[PDB]
Design an enzyme around this catalytic site. Sequence first.
Site, short mmCIF file in Angstrom:
data_model
loop_
_atom_site.label_atom_id
_atom_site.label_comp_id
_atom_site.label_asym_id
_atom_site.label_seq_id
_atom_site.Cartn_x
_atom_site.Cartn_y
_atom_site.Cartn_z
N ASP A 126 11.74 -21.52 -4.73
CA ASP A 126 13.12 -21.26 -5.11
C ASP A 126 13.58 -19.82 -4.95
O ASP A 126 14.39 -19.34 -5.74
CB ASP A 126 13.35 -21.71 -6.55
N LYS A 179 14.47 -24.90 -13.48
CA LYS A 179 13.77 -23.64 -13.66
C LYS A 179 14.75 -22.58 -14.17
O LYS A 179 15.88 -22.48 -13.71
CB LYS A 179 13.15 -23.21 -12.32
N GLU A 217 10.47 -20.72 -19.05
CA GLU A 217 9.73 -19.61 -18.46
C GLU A 217 10.00 -18.25 -19.09
O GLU A 217 10.92 -17.54 -18.69
CB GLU A 217 10.01 -19.54 -16.96
N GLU A 265 8.56 -15.08 -19.01
CA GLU A 265 7.59 -14.21 -18.36
C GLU A 265 7.45 -12.80 -18.89
O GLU A 265 8.42 -12.05 -18.94
CB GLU A 265 7.84 -14.13 -16.85
N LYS A 307 6.07 -22.35 -18.66
CA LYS A 307 5.63 -21.53 -17.53
C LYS A 307 5.48 -20.10 -18.01
O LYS A 307 6.39 -19.28 -17.88
CB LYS A 307 6.64 -21.59 -16.37
N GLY A 331 2.24 -14.09 -11.17
CA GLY A 331 2.64 -12.70 -11.22
C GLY A 331 2.30 -11.93 -9.95
O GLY A 331 2.75 -12.29 -8.86
N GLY A 332 1.51 -10.87 -10.09
CA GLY A 332 1.14 -10.06 -8.94
C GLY A 332 -0.27 -10.32 -8.45
O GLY A 332 -0.82 -9.52 -7.69
N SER A 363 2.24 -23.12 -11.01
CA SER A 363 3.63 -23.13 -10.55
C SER A 363 3.66 -21.80 -9.82
O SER A 363 4.09 -20.78 -10.35
CB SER A 363 4.63 -23.09 -11.71
N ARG A 375 4.26 -16.91 -4.52
CA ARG A 375 3.51 -16.03 -3.64
C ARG A 375 2.07 -16.50 -3.47
O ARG A 375 1.51 -16.42 -2.37
CB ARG A 375 3.52 -14.60 -4.20
N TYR A 421 -11.24 -12.21 -29.93
CA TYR A 421 -9.91 -12.41 -29.38
C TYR A 421 -8.94 -12.76 -30.50
O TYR A 421 -7.72 -12.54 -30.32
CB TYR A 421 -9.94 -13.54 -28.35
O1 N3P Z 1 4.45 -9.93 -1.36
C1 N3P Z 1 5.07 -10.41 -2.31
N1 N3P Z 1 5.26 -9.81 -3.48
C2 N3P Z 1 4.75 -8.59 -3.69
C3 N3P Z 1 4.02 -7.91 -2.72
C4 N3P Z 1 3.50 -6.65 -2.98
C5 N3P Z 1 3.70 -6.06 -4.23
CL1 N3P Z 1 3.04 -4.50 -4.57
C6 N3P Z 1 4.42 -6.74 -5.21
C7 N3P Z 1 4.95 -8.00 -4.93
C8 N3P Z 1 5.70 -11.81 -2.22
C9 N3P Z 1 5.38 -12.64 -1.16
C10 N3P Z 1 5.90 -13.93 -1.10
C11 N3P Z 1 5.58 -14.77 -0.03
C12 N3P Z 1 6.11 -16.06 0.02
C13 N3P Z 1 6.95 -16.51 -0.99
C14 N3P Z 1 7.27 -15.67 -2.06
C15 N3P Z 1 6.75 -14.39 -2.11
C16 N3P Z 1 7.07 -13.55 -3.17
C17 N3P Z 1 6.55 -12.26 -3.23
O2 N3P Z 1 6.93 -11.38 -4.20
P1 N3P Z 1 6.99 -12.07 -5.66
O3 N3P Z 1 8.46 -12.69 -5.82
O4 N3P Z 1 5.91 -13.07 -5.85
O5 N3P Z 1 6.88 -10.86 -6.72
#
Ligand code: N3P
Lengths: 351, 350, 349, 349
Positions: free
Chosen positions: B33, B146, B187, B189, B229, B272-273, B300, B303, B350
């Site tokens: 989305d 969402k 969600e 977050e 979420k 997240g990241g 869910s 990236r 914990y």
């Molecule tokens: O390379 C990405 N993010 C990112 C890279 C590097 C740093 Cl340092 C922080 C964040 C990334 C890649 C995608 C690929 C395909 C769909 C959604 C994506 C969303 C996305 O960013 P995100 O919305 O998941 O935060």
Amino acid sequence: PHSHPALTPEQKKELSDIAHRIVAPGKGILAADESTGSIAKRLQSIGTENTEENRRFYRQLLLTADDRVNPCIGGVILFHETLYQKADDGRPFPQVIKSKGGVVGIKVDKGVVPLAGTNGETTTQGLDGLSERCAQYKKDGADFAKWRCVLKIGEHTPSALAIMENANVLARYASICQQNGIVPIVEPEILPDGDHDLKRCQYVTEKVLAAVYKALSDHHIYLEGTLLKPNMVTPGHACTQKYSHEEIAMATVTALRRTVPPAVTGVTFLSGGQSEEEASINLNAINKCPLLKPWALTFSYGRALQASALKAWGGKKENLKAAQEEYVKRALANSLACQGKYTPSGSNHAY
Amino acid sequence: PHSHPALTPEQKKELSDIAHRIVAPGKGILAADESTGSIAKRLQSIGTENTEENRRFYRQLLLTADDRVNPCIGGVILFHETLYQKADDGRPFPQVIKSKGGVVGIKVDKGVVPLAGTNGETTTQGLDGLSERCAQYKKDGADFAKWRCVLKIGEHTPSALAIMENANVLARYASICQQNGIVPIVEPEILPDGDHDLKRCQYVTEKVLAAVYKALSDHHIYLEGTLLKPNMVTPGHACTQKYSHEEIAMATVTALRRTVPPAVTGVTFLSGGQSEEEASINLNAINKCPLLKPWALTFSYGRALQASALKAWGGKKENLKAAQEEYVKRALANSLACQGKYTPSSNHAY
Amino acid sequence: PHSHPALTPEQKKELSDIAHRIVAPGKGILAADESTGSIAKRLQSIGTENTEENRRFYRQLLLTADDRVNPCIGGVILFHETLYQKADDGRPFPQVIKSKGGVVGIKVDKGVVPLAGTNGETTTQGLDGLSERCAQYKKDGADFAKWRCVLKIGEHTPSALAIMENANVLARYASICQQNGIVPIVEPEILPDGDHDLKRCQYVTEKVLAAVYKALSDHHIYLEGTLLKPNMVTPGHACTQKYSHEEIAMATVTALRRTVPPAVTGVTFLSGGQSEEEASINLNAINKCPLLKPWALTFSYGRALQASALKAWGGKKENLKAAQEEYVKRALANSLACQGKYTPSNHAY
Amino acid sequence: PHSHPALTPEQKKELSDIAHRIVAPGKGILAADESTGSIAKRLQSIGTENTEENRRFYRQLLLTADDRVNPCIGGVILFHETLYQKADDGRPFPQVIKSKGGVVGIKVDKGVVPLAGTNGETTTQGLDGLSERCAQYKKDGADFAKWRCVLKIGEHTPSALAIMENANVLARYASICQQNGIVPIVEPEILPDGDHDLKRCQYVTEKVLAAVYKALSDHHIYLEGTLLKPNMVTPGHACTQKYSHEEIAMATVTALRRTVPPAVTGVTFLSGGQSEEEASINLNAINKCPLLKPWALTFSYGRALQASALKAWGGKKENLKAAQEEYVKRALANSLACQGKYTPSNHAY
Ligand SMILES: O=C(Nc1ccc(Cl)cc1)c1cc2ccccc2cc1OP(=O)(O)O
Ligand SMILES: O=C(Nc1ccc(Cl)cc1)c1cc2ccccc2cc1OP(=O)(O)O
Ligand SMILES: O=C(Nc1ccc(Cl)cc1)c1cc2ccccc2cc1OP(=O)(O)O
Ligand SMILES: O=C(Nc1ccc(Cl)cc1)c1cc2ccccc2cc1OP(=O)(O)O
């Protein structure tokens, strides 16, 4: 939004271990913490003088029951007086309880008091000097405590004030107990008085429990080191509509599943006005309910465990064995019920 | 209090059945989305023009992968634009998703807005006319929604205001969704930004979720007809102290056990990241945690499910198979992970 | 908690100055923000086709009333459409209002929506994109805004949910307005529907206002830069017990004294279902009430200022002067009323 | 919500009359309720043995000052022990106080206790059996009570929990007092400890008072029958930035205007760590502050009224007159201060 640990890993471990022992598979709680004023009616119902000696004898009669109750009783709640009494052999009652595998509990609240501006609603007192009292009780053998809050279902109750105040005081009580190594049993009893139906009770129970756990969270309460003593969800006493035990169980389990975090170690139901047999059947149905239940669902009965024993005793020493026999029978029955293995032989979306 | 049923037994059944289908054993959600404003960087990273046709193509690429992803995908979250686009064969994307056994989801929030008087905190908007929008999305094939709220761990954040306000808006959104037969995915977050340790994230997560569920209760939300979420419990992105996947799993499961009522049908974690691999390993560790978990614990991911697929595609139509293959690889890795069957290649503390 | 200034000293001064100008001694507010859907019933009662033209003319009729209203009207609430309309001479309505010494206001809520799980209760929507709208409205002449929340007194209402939700949305709206230099008028209206008595209304009004100001505090609202638009405290429409204007005033002033902080610049009462005369008489009694009132107590009337004027107009341009005369008389009546000088023709609380 | 009158009109009248008498024009409160544990250090500072007789004597010395203090003292707070002590002429101290036109107050809290999970924060206990204690104290001459809650400004304090819990217990205390005809003085003290500046104290004070008044509303407290004893708004003791008395008065009055409902009968300020002169000067400035103040602004001083007196006495019975003279001087100064008659850019707030 910063953490200042209320408890260390050791303290948490101690509290969690105590909580789990009390509600271990097949075990429940004997509530024998009637006050000198409350036990008065019980004794007068069998024509017995309300003296410290008769109270001692009665409590002894229950606490010294044969070893059959051992696997049935995980905990025993006592009133202050009893905690410091001794059996005929000279052994302190708490020692007697422990030697039988039970954990000793102590009532620490000081009764209900009226909430001004409400329709006969109350809150509970007893926080003053509670920490010192808990420290002393811990040293004298107690490992868990009892505090009772009472709410009533009516046209304008429980009110927002009553719900909020009772939930807050229960949280303060739990916080103080845990600081002293005492497992607090949170008891937000919703009275069965009235003609309301099953759905009404479930609704109120869900709202009350939601408030209770939010307060425990606000006060940094360690849930794994606590137990919950709620009312089962049932229609009011004056309700005209009839319900099966399966419906009582589904409404009760549903309410709990929607509000009680799985971290809570156990739920020890109060029986309210139910008969001994009724309390066992419902507790059994609850344990039979076809829904996932992440916490132990057992009993914490007073009237539902002593009723017949008190009657059989009649205040006569000659009926000692017969009295103990009645208590043992209810202990075994409920032990099976909190496992869903009880028998007289010895749609979820609608909720 | 007094009861005035928000839902009938029939409406409850519909919502509960939907929620359970999305998180059925081994299934997770594909979060596709991304708004035109977020998808922009994605395409830019692969030197691809951010046009409607390229976005439609990329989405088709993911949504039309072979049947190997079917058992892995219980739901797919789409952006408004995509809900009304069609594959090369003329089939609407909602039909393509359903034919593969998935439930169609729709993002309905309108982004975050700043909360005045706070240190850069926000709440989320999108409630205006939400009921009418939900009624239309339902008719157009969507069965869940969402809505993303964002909180940040800092010296003075999340503040009491941010927690209370975001919890309340999530409750409003959930209430409106359920009135229209749409399962709301709550969600809340908590960003991983910062150098806070694991214990700090667990503490904040616990406080936020307690606030979220009290709000859901206040607004009469039917939990069996909802999904959660949340962020997994992990140390700050810049935390010097290091932890093991088992520690992250224990901290995460404990936080949830202390705040999420068993009635909640399922938890669909956001990555997240985290990298694609890290997201799968942590979800696997979470499902292997030796504690009782009364709800499905799945994924869910956005990236964490598309990273490689997007790269393999590279905007070239001749890389369709290669790209979808990477997507399928992650789908399979996470389907096993949400069951504790994935392998790459004292709780009182914990 | 920690302070992260929502407003600078300059922003505060602008908001406070606007708030004080609107409720300056003897001044009140003309509420002419009826939506095209709400005004339909009005024009219907006078057999007048509901067209943008007739709506423009009617609004023009009110806004261009003779200068006798100038010292009576401190502010005028307009509906979106009207804010962008012009008088026959070409002057934009906002300009017409300002030239007569009035502050321009704009309705920004998007109506009420039902609260699931309640006995017919509602909350109000309109926060989406509100910041951008307020900035646009500010640039186009508006200095204050209106947002209406609605609560009802019943057997199970107003519930804790409805009270909490409405107070919270009011705070969000107020916060967004202040960030854009717009003074928010907080309007938590408790309907007079039902047979409840005076003390019941007073009780509910007190609980609602307490919730409202706690929410404003939680959202860091600058009270000096706000106005309150509450209902007067009165018995329900179907109440069989009768009360005097002095009792209504005492209940009203007592309720406000127990909940509204002195910092609030002014209270602009809504008239609800009261007639023009009734609304003036009650506002007058409120200002004559012996108790100490730390805020301006005035009006923000719609029906209580337009009733007779609308009827006198009857959609006929020939009735312009006759219609305006009715409005002017009510404007004058209420100006005297908000000063406690209008004459037609406490432990028990 | 539904009303279930906590108090009858008669009960409200009694509470209101008591509260108004305590803070009548020119009058304030003498806080001589030092706990036997706190008074010890006081007697220690003057090498005086901490006996019941010495304590009795010292209290007698303050309570029996010449008639010049009668117009200055509206109320006197006593500790349990002192409430049952008698002067050298056999008169119970409560009778002595009353004969001089003062109202008798009694400390009813049982001290602070630690709140688990916080950074050294506390709540206050004393609710158990409070109703019975109040009924008895009422019969023994007391008409108002004292209960102290303590909050501290730091990096993570006051916390949401500390604020909520303390406001709630204060509300429970006030409810029980009013049920027994005793006027509760709500005392949410925010300590001056720390290096925070003026605006930080004002921010915290406003947040605390907002919580306090929401709680009192939730608990159905009759505000006209209550008094507020807050800290003056000042920078922390270790703050570098210096402020004038006018700035302290402005920040203090602004905080109160933004949180305290007009219905509150009066504010009796605690002096914290201020000197006797400092306390009088600040109180004077507060009363001279340009802003509208719908409540009496007076004092409830302990150290600020006894400092010099205690020193002049030195435990020497022969220094009675000298000691009493020092007290009388401070009572006279503060009596003038609460009237703004003592002499030894509000948008920025
Ligand atoms: O390379 C990405 N993010 C990112 C890279 C590097 C740093 Cl340092 C922080 C964040 C990334 C890649 C995608 C690929 C395909 C769909 C959604 C994506 C969303 C996305 O960013 P995100 O919305 O998941 O935060
Ligand atoms: O039958 C009882 N009470 C009762 C029955 C009927 C009406 Cl109408 C009211 C109250 C009862 C019996 C006991 C027996 C033994 C210990 C404790 C007992 C407590 C108790 O009263 P309870 O604390 O369980 O409510
Ligand atoms: O006569 C009115 N309403 C009414 C009267 C009596 C009953 Cl019983 C019900 C409703 C009325 C007249 C107006 C005239 C001109 C502008 C706005 C007007 C708004 C208005 O109604 P309102 O929008 O203020 O609720
Ligand atoms: O000088 C005092 N205290 C103090 C000074 C300096 C630091 Cl650093 C800390 C505390 C003081 C003097 C008194 C004189 C007479 C009665 C009561 C008195 C209470 C009192 O202590 P308090 O209750 O006002 O805080």
